Design a protein around this ligand. Structure first.
Ligand SMILES: CCCCCCCC(=O)OC[C@H](COP(=O)(O)O[C@@H]1[C@H](O)[C@@H](OP(=O)(O)O)[C@H](OP(=O)(O)O)[C@@H](OP(=O)(O)O)[C@H]1O)OC(=O)CCCCCCC
Ligand SMILES: *[C@@H]1O[C@H](CO)[C@@H](O[C@@H]2O[C@H](CO)[C@@H](O[C@@H]3O[C@H](CO)[C@@H](O)[C@H](O)[C@@H]3O)[C@H](O)[C@H]2NC(C)=O)[C@H](O)[C@H]1NC(C)=O
Ligand SMILES: *[C@@H]1O[C@H](CO)[C@@H](O)[C@H](O)[C@H]1NC(C)=O
Ligand SMILES: *[C@@H]1O[C@H](CO)[C@@H](O)[C@H](O)[C@H]1NC(C)=O
Ligand SMILES: [Mg+2]
Lengths: 1125, 327
C-alpha cells in the first residue's frame, strides 16, 4: 500500500489581489496583518525584547538564581554586611558580559538575514517593472525572475519566455531531488500576460487555500476576465525553487515570508542548552544545599557556644539581650554570607569567556576554510562548544551535503567488453595514461575526462558497428532540449543522468543537434543525419525505462530503449550472446558504486508498427485514462529487445565524505542519511559513501514492518537481529509513516492509541539503532525532524544535523547541534544552523579536534573551578571551631574580593582556551580518543564530588598546618606575627601558591601565557597587597617560620596530588597518555583506501545498481509542441 | 568572508611545552623533598628544644595555690606571689609574655569592636566614634577615647619578678616596656590625636573606657608611651588569631657583663591580680623565653617536616616499585 516514489506531505479562505496592495491591506484582514511581508526573521532580539528575553534565558542558569538570592539577603539591614550599592553591580557586570556576547551573535545573524532580504528581484510597483529587495514584496505583487534566480515566494506562474509559458525549476533545496520539474501556466494567462505592459494593469483575484505545509499539492482558484480558472501545484513555484533553462518568468506572489509552504515546514526555534549546562545547574543546586547545611550546622554550634562560653564571657558583652538560640539563628545568615564564595560570581563569566574564545578557533581554522568558494567555518552560536565533543549520532542530508550535484559518465559495457579503464592503444600498457584527445570531434569539449583510448579507436575504426550504435542510442533515447542561440550547442537536460549520457555521447562523436515535434537531428561522426521520431515511450517511476521509436533516413523503423537492468532483462530476446557478459559488467559497476542503465533495441517491421501505431494513438487520444492505457501499448512493443550494453554514471561525492564517515565510525558516531531524494539515488550514495558495503544486508520498509509486528504480537529487550550480523535500513518516507503508525469513551481510547504509538516508536529506534547504517529517503522536512526527535527521546543521545537547503532546517533546529553547509547560493540551512562550514569533510575537525578539546577544556575548567573555591571557602568553616562559630573570616576583607577575580581568574581561563592533550594531527589520526566524550567520563557527577573532596581536604591542610605552627611559638619577638592578621596572610599566601601550582599540574599545554598567568597570579598577590599595606605582610612574610609554614603547607597539599596523578597514569593510563608516550615512535599512517575489489562469482545479480533521476510528462511535451519553440 | 589569519594563536599551534609525569620527573622530586624536609625538620626540632622556656600559671582557679585569694577580690588591690625556680640560667635577651587561655579575641562580635580611624589620630573621629564600637561608644555624655570592646577589656595585671639570692633579699629585675609593639603599629597605625602638646588637652571632652580604672592620659609617664601609642595598649589591640595566645609584656635585655641575664636559682613572681577570667574558664600565664635566631620555640614544625620528609621519601619508594612493577 505505501508508495515508494512520493514524499508524504499529507501525513504532516486566503485571498490575493494583483498590483492592488491597498485592498488586501483592509482593516478586516488586519489583526492585532494576516498577510506577512516577504522579509524573513531569524534573529531573536529585534528592538526591545532583549531585556525581557535575554534575562529570562539568562536565569535559566542555577547560579544566577543563587547570586540573586544572595543579593536579596545582603539587602536585609540586620544581617547585611555591605552597603547594597556595590553588591548588585557585580551581578549586573557579569550579566552584561553574557548579554553583550549574546547581542554580538544576534547582530551577526541579523546581518545574515539582510543578505537574503537584499536579493533584488524585480516587481511591479509603477507603470513598469522596478527592481526591489525581497522584503519589499507583499502578497499580490506581480514579479519577474530571470535564469538561476531563486523564487522570492510562492508565486502563481503567469507567463514566461518558453513557449506555452513553461518554466523549469530545480527543487534541490525544497527536496533532495536533483532534476528539473516543468511548471505550466493557464492558457488564458499565457496568451494575455506576455508583454510587460499588460502585467502592470493585471487585476486578478485568487481564492486559494490558507497557508499550509503541503508542497506537493495546492488548491485554489483565479477569478479574472469574468471567469473562474482553477489552479494546482503545477502552476505554483515554491520559495526555494531555482529557475533553470528559462530566460524570464512572471509570477504573482501568493504567499510571502513565513506563509510560504517551505517556511511553514521549518520547525520551531528552541533554546539550545549544552549537556554540561544542565550538569552545572545540578552542581550549583548541590552546593546551595551544602551551603545551607553547613551554615545551619555552624549556626547551631554557635548557639550551643553562646549558651555556656559566650554568655559567661564578660569581654563579649554587646548590650543586646539576645538569647543563645536567637544569636545562633542570626549567625546562620552570617555564614551564608561567609561561605557564599563557595560558588563565586565568576563561574559564568569564565564559561562565557571560554566558549567565546573556543568558538573563535572554529572561525579562524584554516583547515576548515574552503578556498574554492572562499568560505571559512562559522560558529554562529557561541554557547554550544563542549557539546561538539559529545555527539552520539549524525543525521545528514545528501543532495548538496554528501554530494556535489555533479554526475559524470565513467564506464560502459558494450558487447561484454567493459570500456572506461585506464588504457592506451589497443591494449593496456600502464596506469599513468593521459586524457583522451577529443580534438578530432568538432562538438566535443574538455569537460569529459575519459581515460581510455581503446574505445576511441573502436568508434573511429568502425570495425565493431555496435559500438557506434551504443552511443547513437544515448544521443536519441533521451528527452533533453538543445540550445544553439549562438552556436554553442548547450544541452538543457531535465535529468542529471540524461545530461551526463547525452553530453558523454556528444563528446564521442554522436551529438544531438536539433529536435522537433516529429524529427531528431543527431550528427554521427560529422555526418548530419536527421531521424524521424514516431513515438516517445515516456519514463515513469514504475516503468523504470524510457524508449523511443524512430525511422532512419533509409526508411527502416527502430526502437531504442534504456532503463533498469531488471525491467529490460525481462524483455530481452531469447537469443542474446551478450546477456551473460553484460550482467557481469552491471555487477562490476554495482560493486564500484555507480548508476547502471541497460541499453537495448529491436527491429520493427513496417506492418508490425502500423497495427501498433493505431493502438498507440488510441491510447494517447483517450484522455479518460491516458496514462494507464498508454502503459499497455508501451508493453506491447517492448517484447523482444536486443541487448547493447550498459552505462555507469558516477554521482560525485564531496571530497572527504567516504573518509569522514570511516573516521567518525572509529570515533563511534553513527551516521544516518535522512534525504528527500528517491530510493535508488539514496541507496547508491550509501554505497559510494561506504556506509553500505557488500557485507551489509539491506532491509527495507517491508522487512522492518514485519519485524516490528512480530514484537507487537509477541508481547500481546531481545535484539531484532543476531548480534554478530551486519545490517542496514533503507526506509522510505512512506514506509516510515507506516512503521511508526503515523499515517467518555472518546478520550479513554486515546491513551491506548498513544500508548501503542509510544511503544512502536521505541521499538523502531531500538531496531534502527541496532543497524550499522540507516538511510531514510523520500522523507518530508517534518519527518526529518521526527527521526531526530525519536533518537533524542528514546536513546537520550546527542544528535548532530548537517545539511543545506530549506528541507534540512527543521532537523537542524531539532538536533542538539545543527550544522549548515555554506558556500552555496542557497543559505536557508546556514541561517538556522549553529555552525556553518562549506564542506562535509570539515566535520572531522569540528568533532575530533574542536569538539573533542572543547569538552576536555571545559571539564578541566569545571574540575578546577570547584576546587579552588572549596579550598578557599572551607577555611572559614574550619576556623569556626576556633573563633566560637562567630563567622569570622580567616582572610582579610580585601583578599576575599580579589581572590575570585584577580588571583585565580586568569590561570584557568587560559587553560580553557589553550589546553591540548594531543596534537590536532594526532587527534584526527586517533578518532578513538573521542569516545571519552560519548560516555561522559571526564566530568561525571562523581568527578564533581571528587573535586569537592579535593577542595575539602586542601582546605583542611591550608588551615590546620598554619594553625599547628601558631598554637605554639612562631617567631615571637618584637615584630611577632602571632596575631590574626598574620594568621590571615599565611593561609592566604599558602592558598594562592597551592591553587596556582594545581593549575600548573592540571595544564598539559604550557604556552608562555599559560606559564605567565600561573606565576603572574602568584607574583601579583605578593605585590598587590603591599600596595594596600595595614603593614601586616611587611612583618608576617619576613619570618623564617612564616615561610617554613607556607612551604610545608604547599608541599603537603601538592605532593599527594602528584602521587595520585602519577599512579593513575602508570597503572591505568588513558587513551591520550598511551599516545603521548609513543608519540615519537608513531610513523605508520596509511591514507584511507577504498575497497579496490570485492569481485565475486556465483550469483547472476546480487544487487541492482539501477538509479535514474527523472520525471514523467517530459515526453508528452516533445510529442506535442509545448516544449518546441 | 576571507581567509583566516595564519597566526600561531588563532591556529592553536602556539609554541608550548608538554610536560609528562614520567618516572624520571616525579620520583626524584619525591626524594629531593624527602632529603630536604628531614634535615630542616631535624634542625627545627633541635633548635626549638635548645630554647629555655618557663611557663607559670597564676590564674589561681584551683585551691592550694597562693593566688586563689584573688579569685574573689573583696578588696580591689589583690596580689599573688608565685614561687618558681630556673634549672638553667637564661642567656641573651629574655622575653616576658602574658598568656590568656580560652580567650576568644578572634570572635567576630569582638574583633570588629574598634574604631581604626580614631586610633589613627583623627580629630573628627575622636568625638564621633563609629558604630562598630557601639556598646562602648559613649559612657555618660561624652565618647570613649579608645572605644570598643577590644580596648575596654585590656589586660591590666601588673607582673613583677624578684631574684632570691643568698641573702634572700628580693632583687628587682629590670623590665623594659619600650619597643614591644609592632613598629608599624607604633608609628603608623596608632597615633595620638593632633593639637596641643600635653595629651590632657588633646583628649578634651572624652571619658575613659568603662572598664579602665584611669584615663588614657597617664598610661605612662613618658609622653612617648602614653596615649593611643602606648606599648601595652598597642600590643593588646593586635587581636590574636586563636583562643589561646600570648602577648609580649616586657623585655629583659642582656646584662652588660658576661653573666647570664637570669642566673639560675629561686625566683618569685609578684602579680597584681586585676584581670578576671575565671568566669569563662580562662587561664592566665607568665612565659619567659630566650631570643632565638630561628624565630621562637616551635616543636610542631620540626615534627611536621620530619613526618612529611619521611612520607615523601616513603612515597618515592612506593612509587618507584610500582613503576618497576608496571615497567
Ligand atoms: C594522602 C591520601 C589522599 C588520598 C585521597 C583518596 C583519593 C582521592 O579521592 O583523591 C582526592 C582528590 C583527587 O584529586 P584528582 O582529581 O587530582 O584525582 C584524580 C586524578 O586526577 C586521576 O587522574 P586524571 O584522570 O584527573 O588525569 C584520576 O584518574 P582516573 O579517573 O582514571 O582514575 C582519578 O580519578 P578517580 O579517583 O578514579 O575517579 C583521581 O585520582 O585529591 C587528591 O588526590 C588528594 C588530595 C588530598 C591531599 C592530601 C590529604 C592529606
Ligand atoms: C581591670 O580590668 C577589669 C576588667 O577589664 C576591671 O573590672 C571591671 O571594672 C569595672 C569598673 O572598674 C566594672 O564596671 C562597672 O563597675 C561598677 C562599679 O563602679 C559596677 O557597679 C558595675 O556593675 C560594673 O561592674 C566591670 O564590671 C569590671 N569587670 C569585671 C569583669 O570585673 C577592673 O576594674 C580593672 N582594674 C584596673 C585597676 O584597671
Ligand atoms: C614563696 O616565696 C616567699 C618568699 O619569696 C616565701 O615567703 C613563701 O613562704 C614561699 N611560699 C611557698 C609556697 O613556697
Ligand atoms: C608586690 O608588688 C606590690 C605593688 O608594687 C608591692 O606593694 C608589694 O610590696 C610587692 N611584694 C609582695 C606582694 O610580696
Ligand atoms: Mg540538500
Amino acid at each position: 500500500q505505501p508508495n515508494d516514489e512520493v514524499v508524504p506531505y499529507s501525513d504532516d479562505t486566503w485571498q490575493v489581489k494583483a498590483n492592488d496592495r491597498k485592498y488586501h491591506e483592509q482593516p478586516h484582514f488586519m489583526n492585532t496583518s494576516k498577510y506577512a511581508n516577504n522579509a524573513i526573521k531569524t534573529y531573536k532580539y529585534n528592538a526591545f525584547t532583549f531585556i525581557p528575553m535575554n534575562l529570562f534565558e539568562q536565569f535559566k542558569r542555577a547560579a544566577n538564581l543563587y547570586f540573586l538570592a544572595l543579593l536579596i539577603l545582603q539587602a536585609v539591614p540586620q544581617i547585611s554586611t555591605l552597603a547594597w550599592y556595590t553588591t548588585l553591580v557585580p551581578l549586573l557586570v557579569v550579566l552584561g558580559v553574557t548579554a553583550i556576547k549574546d547581542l554580538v551573535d544576534d547582530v551577526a545573524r541579523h546581518k545574515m538575514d539582510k543578505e537574503i532580504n537584499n536579493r533584488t528581484c524585480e516587481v511591479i510597483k509603477d507603470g513598469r517593472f522596478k527592481v526591489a529587495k525581497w522584503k519589499e514584496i507583499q502578497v499580490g505583487d506581480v514579479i519577474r525572475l530571470k535564469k538561476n534566480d531563486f523564487v522570492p515566494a510562492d508565486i502563481l506562474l503567469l507567463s514566461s519566455s518558453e513557449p506555452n509559458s513553461l518554466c523549469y525549476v530545480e527543487t534541490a533545496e525544497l527536496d533532495g531531488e536533483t532534476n528539473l520539474k516543468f511548471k505550466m501556466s493557464l492558457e488564458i494567462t499565457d496568451q494575455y500576460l506576455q508583454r510587460e505592459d499588460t502585467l502592470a494593469t493585471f487585476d486578478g483575484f485568487i481564492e486559494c487555500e490558507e497557508p499550509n505545509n503541503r508542497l506537493d499539492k495546492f488548491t485554489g482558484t483565479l477569478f479574472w476576465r469574468n471567469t473562474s480558472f482553477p489552479l494546482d501545484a503545477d502552476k505554483i513555484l515554491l520559495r526555494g525553487c531555482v529557475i533553470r533553462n528559462t530566460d524570464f518568468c512572471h509570477g504573482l506572489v501568493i504567499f510571502a515570508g513565513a506563509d510560504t509552504k517551505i517556511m511553514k515546514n521549518s520547525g520551531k526555534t528552541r533554546f539550545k542548552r549544552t549537556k554540561i549546562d544542565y550538569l552545572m545547574n545540578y552542581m550549583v543546586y548541590t552546593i546551595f544545599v551544602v551551603l545551607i547545611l553547613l551554615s545551619a550546622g555552624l549556626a547551631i554550634g554557635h548557639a550551643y557556644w553562646e549558651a555556656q562560653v559566650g554568655n559567661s564571657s564578660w569581654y563579649l558583652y554587646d548590650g543586646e539581650d539576645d538569647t543563645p538560640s536567637y544569636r545562633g539563628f542570626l549567625i546562620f545568615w552570617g555564614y551564608i554570607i561567609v561561605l557564599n564564595t563557595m560558588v563565586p560570581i565568576s563561574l559564568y563569566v569564565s564559561v562565557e569567556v571560554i566558549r567565546l574564545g573556543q568558538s573563535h578557533f572554529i572561525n579562524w581554522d584554516l583547515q576548515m576554510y574552503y578556498a574554492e568558494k572562499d568560505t571559512p567555518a562559522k560558529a554562529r552560536t557561541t554557547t554550544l562548544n563542549e557539546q561538539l565533543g559529545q555527539i552520539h549520532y549524525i543525521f545528514s542530508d545528501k543532495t548538496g551535503t554528501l554530494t556535489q550535484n555533479i554526475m559524470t559518465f565513467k564506464k560502459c559495457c558494450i558487447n561484454g567488453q567493459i570500456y572506461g579503464d585506464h588504457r592506451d592503444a589497443s591494449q593496456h600498457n600502464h596506469n599513468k595514461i593521459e586524457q583522451v584527445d577529443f580534438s578530432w570531434n568538432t562538438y566535443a569539449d574538455g569537460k569529459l575526462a575519459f581515460y581510455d583510448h581503446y574505445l576511441i579507436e573502436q568508434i573511429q575504426s568502425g570495425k565493431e558497428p555496435e559500438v557506434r550504435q551504443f552511443f547513437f542510442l544515448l544521443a536519441v533515447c533521451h528527452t533533453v532540449m538543445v540550445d544553439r542561440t549562438d552556436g554553442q550547442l548547450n544541452y538543457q537536460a531535465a535529468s542529471p543522468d540524461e545530461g551526463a549520457l547525452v553530453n558523454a555521447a556528444r563528446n564521442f562523436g554522436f551529438a544531438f543537434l536539433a529536435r522537433t515535434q516529429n524529427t531528431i537531428t543527431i550528427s554521427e561522426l560529422g555526418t548530419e543525419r536527421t531521424y524521424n521520431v514516431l513515438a516517445i515511450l515516456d519514463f515513469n517511476s514504475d516503468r523504470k525505462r524510457m524508449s523511443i521509436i524512430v525511422r532512419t533516413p533509409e526508411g527502416n523503423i527502430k526502437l531504442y530503449c534504456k532503463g533498469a537492468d531488471t525491467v529490460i532483462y525481462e524483455r530481452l530476446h531469447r537469443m542474446n550472446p551478450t546477456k551473460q557478459e553484460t550482467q557481469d559488467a552491471l555487477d562490476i559497476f554495482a560493486n564500484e558504486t555507480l548508476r547502471t542503465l541497460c541499453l537495448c533495441y529491436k527491429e520493427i517491421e513496417e506492418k508490425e508498427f502500423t497495427e501498433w501505431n493505431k493502438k498507440f494513438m488510441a491510447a494517447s487520444v483517450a484522455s479518460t485514462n491516458r496514462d494507464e492505457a498508454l502503459d499497455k501499448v508501451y508493453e506491447e512493443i517492448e517484447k523482444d529487445l536486443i541487448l547493447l550494453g550498459a552505462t555507469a554514471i558516477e554521482d560525485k561525492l564531496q571530497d572527504g565524505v567516504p573518509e569522514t564517515i570511516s573516521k567518525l565510525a572509529k570515533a563511534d558516531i553513527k551516521i544516518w542519511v535522512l534525504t528527500g531524494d528517491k530510493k535508488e539515488t539514496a541507496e547508491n550514495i550509501g554505497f559510494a559513501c561506504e556506509l553500505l558495503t557488500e557485507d551489509t544486508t539491506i532491509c527495507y520498509g517491508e522487512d522492518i514492518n514485519s519485524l516490528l509486528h512480530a514484537r507487537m504480537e509477541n508481547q500481546r529487550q531481545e535484539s531484532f537481529f543476531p548480534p554478530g550480523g551486519n545490517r542496514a535500513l533503507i526506509i522510505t518516507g512512506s514506509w516510515l509513516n507506516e512503521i511508526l503508525l503515523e499515517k467518555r469513551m472518546r478520550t479513554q481510547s486515546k491513551r491506548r492509541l498513544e500508548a501503542k504509538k509510544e511503544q512502536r516508536q521505541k521499538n523502531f529506534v531500538d531496531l534502527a539503532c541496532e543497524c550499522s547504517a540507516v538511510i531514510c529517503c523520500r522523507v518530508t522536512p517534518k519527518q526529518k525532524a521526527m527521526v531526530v526527535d525519536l533518537v533524542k527521546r528514546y536513546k537520550k543521545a546527542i544528535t548532530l544535523a548537517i545539511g543545506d537547503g530549506a528541507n534540512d532546517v527543521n532537523m537542524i533546529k531539532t538536533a542538539h547541534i545543527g550544522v549548515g553547509i555554506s558556500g552555496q547560493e542557497g543559505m536557508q540551512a546556514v541561517m538556522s544552523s549553529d555552525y556553518s562550514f562549506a564542506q562535509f569533510r570539515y566535520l572531522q575537525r569540528l568533532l575530533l579536534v574542536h569538539g573533542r578539546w572543547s569538552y576536555i577544556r571545559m571539564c578541566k575548567f569545571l574540575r578546577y573551578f570547584f576546587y579552588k573555591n572549596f579550598a578557599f571557602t572551607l577555611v572559614h568553616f574550619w576556623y569556626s571551631f576556633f573563633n566560637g562559630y562567630s563567622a569570622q573570616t580567616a582572610y582579610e576583607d580585601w583578599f576575599i574580593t580579589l581572590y575570585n577575580v584577580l588571583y585565580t581568574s586568569l590561570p584557568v581561563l587560559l587553560m580553557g582556551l589553550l589546553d591540548q592533550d594531543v596534537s590536532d594531527k594526532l587527534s584526527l589520526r586517533f578518532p578513538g580518543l573521542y569516545i571519552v566524550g560519548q560516555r561522559d567520563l571526564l566530568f561525571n557527577y562523581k568527578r564533581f564530588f571528587v573535586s569537592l573532596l579535593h577542595g575539602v581536604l586542601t582546605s583542611m591542610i591550608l588551615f590546620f598546618i598554619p594553625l599547628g605552627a601558631y598554637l605554639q611559638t612562631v617567631g615571637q619577638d618584637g615584630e611577632a606575627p602571632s596575631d590574626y592578621q598574620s594568621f590571615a596572610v599565611t593561609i592566604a599566601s599558602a592558598l594562592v601558591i597551592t591553587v596556582n601550582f594545581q593549575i600548573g599540574l592540571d595544564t598539559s599545554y604550557w604556552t608562555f601565557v599559560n606559564a605567565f598567568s600561573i606565576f603572574g597570579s602568584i607574583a601579583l598577590y605578593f605585590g598587590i597587597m603591599f600596595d594596600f599595606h595595614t603593614g601586616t605582610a611587611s612583618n608576617a612574610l619576613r619570618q623564617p617560620y612564616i615561610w617554613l609554614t607556607i612551604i610545608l603547607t604547599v608541599a603537603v597539599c601538592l605532593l599527594p596530588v602528584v602521587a595520585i596523578r602519577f599512579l593513575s597514569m602508570t597503572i591505568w593510563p588513558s587513551e591520550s597518555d598511551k599516545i603521548q608516550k609513543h608519540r615519537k615512535r608513531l610513523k605508520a599512517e596509511e591514507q584511507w583506501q577504498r575497497r579496490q575489489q570485492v569481485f565475486r562469482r556465483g550469483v547472476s545479480t546480487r544487487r541492482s545498481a539501477y538509479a535514474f533521476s527523472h520525471q514523467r510528462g517530459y515526453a508528452d511535451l516533445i510529442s506535442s509542441g509545448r516544449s518546441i519553440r | 568572508t576571507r581567509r583566516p589569519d595564519n597566526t600561531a594563536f588563532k591556529q592553536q599551534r602556539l609554541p608550548a611545552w608538554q610536560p609528562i609525569l614520567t618516572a624520571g620527573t616525579v620520583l626524584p622530586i619525591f626524594f629531593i623533598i624527602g632529603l630536604i624536609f628531614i634535615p630542616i625538620g631535624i634542625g627545627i626540632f633541635v633548635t626549638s628544644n635548645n630554647i629555655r622556656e618557663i611557663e607559670i600559671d597564676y590564674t589561681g582557679t584551683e585551691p592550694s595555690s597562693p593566688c586563689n585569694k584573688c579569685l574573689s577580690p573583696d578588696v580591689t588591690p589583690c596580689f599573688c606571689t608565685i614561687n618558681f625556680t630556673l634549672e638553667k640560667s637564661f642567656e641573651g635577651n629574655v622575653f616576658m609574655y602574658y598568656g590568656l587561655s580560652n580567650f576568644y579575641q578572634n570572635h567576630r562580635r569582638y574583633v570588629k569592636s574598634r574604631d581604626d580611624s580614631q586610633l589613627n589620630g583623627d580629630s573628627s573621629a575622636l568625638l564621633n566614634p563609629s558604630k562598630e564600637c557601639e556598646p562602648y561608644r559613649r559612657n555618660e555624655d561624652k565618647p570613649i577615647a579608645p572605644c570598643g570592646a577590644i580596648a575596654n577589656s585590656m589586660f591590666n595585671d601588673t607582673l613583677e619578678l624578684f631574684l632570691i639570692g643568698n641573702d634572700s633579699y628580693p632583687i628587682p629585675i629590670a623590665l623594659k616596656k619600650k619597643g614591644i609593639a609592632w613598629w608599624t603599629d607604633k608609628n603608623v597605625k596608632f597615633r595620638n590625636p593632633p593639637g596641643g602638646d600635653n595629651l590632657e588637652e588633646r583628649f578634651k571632652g572624652t571619658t575613659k573606657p568603662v572598664n579602665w580604672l584611669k584615663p588614657v592620659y597617664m598610661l605612662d609617664s613618658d609622653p612617648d608611651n602614653n596615649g593611643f601609642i602606648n606599648e601595652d595598649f598597642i600590643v593588646w589591640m593586635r587581636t590574636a588569631a586563636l583562643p589561646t595566645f600570648r602577648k609580649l609584656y616586657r623585655l629583659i635585655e642582656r646584662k652588660s657583663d658576661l653573666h647570664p641575664t637570669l642566673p639560675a636559682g629561686r625566683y618569685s613572681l609578684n602579680v597584681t591580680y586585676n584581670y578576671p577570667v575565671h568566669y569563662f574558664d580562662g587561664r592566665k600565664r607568665m612565659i619567659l623565653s630566650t631570643i632565638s635566631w630561628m624565630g621562637g620555640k616551635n616543636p610542631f614544625l620540626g615534627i611536621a617536616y620530619i613526618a612529611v620528609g619521611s612520607i615523601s621519601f616513603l612515597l618515592g619508594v612506593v612509587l618507584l616499585v610500582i613503576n618497576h612493577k608496571y615497567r
